Amino acid sequence: AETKIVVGPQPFSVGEEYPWLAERDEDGAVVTFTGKVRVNALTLEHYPGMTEKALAEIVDEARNRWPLGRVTVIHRIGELWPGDEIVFVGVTSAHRSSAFEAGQFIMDYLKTRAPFWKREATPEGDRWVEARESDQQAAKRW
């Protein structure tokens, strides 16, 4: 089935993205995940080309493990603010367990394999966000 991958600075709207995902009657289950930034600007650096390739490869692997219908993955770049939605993953399947599992798998892999880096603003200078070993554990369990 079709896959939509978008990497860009522009905001997205779940209300705009959901209808396409939910279009097919054969997909009884639709799961979405939205990740947001929780005054100090965050910037999201990325590796042009590899980022899109990586995201496509993650969805490819998810399709090998689960029988998925439509999938959408959107990740923003450039400067973002507290409260901004940064990432969207939508997955459909005939049944709910595949949609929930694949949705979480895609995020776990995105967090460990997609070339993105966050830098925060803070009063006295910029600070690169630290990665977490817990995300390595979340990814390797699958």
Partner: protein, 81 residues
């Protein structure tokens, strides 16, 4: 020749986005060692058992072989999502 790209902290410390190095190295690690040995800022930038690498836009272990024409990228652990 190998085109080498840098991102995030690695990019900030080396002071460039990219450089084309006209020399042969057997592996990513061999390239890393030779680049790191240029100066103090280079050693700081390319230090670590956390550092990541990609060859031709695929994540790769540091023993991955290199040939003429490859694109190699050095960068920190990813923090997207």
């Amino acid at each position: 020749m190998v085109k080498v790209l840098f991102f995030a902290q690695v990019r900030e410390l080396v002071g460039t986005d990219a450089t084309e190095v006209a020399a042969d190295f057997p592996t990513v690690e061999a390239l890393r060692q030779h680049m790191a040995a240029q100066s103090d800022r280079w050693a700081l930038a390319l230090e670590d058992g956390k550092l990541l690498a990609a060859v031709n836009q695929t994540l790769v272990s540091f023993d991955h072989p290199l040939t003429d024409g490859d694109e190699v990228a050095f960068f920190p652990p990813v923090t997207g999502g």
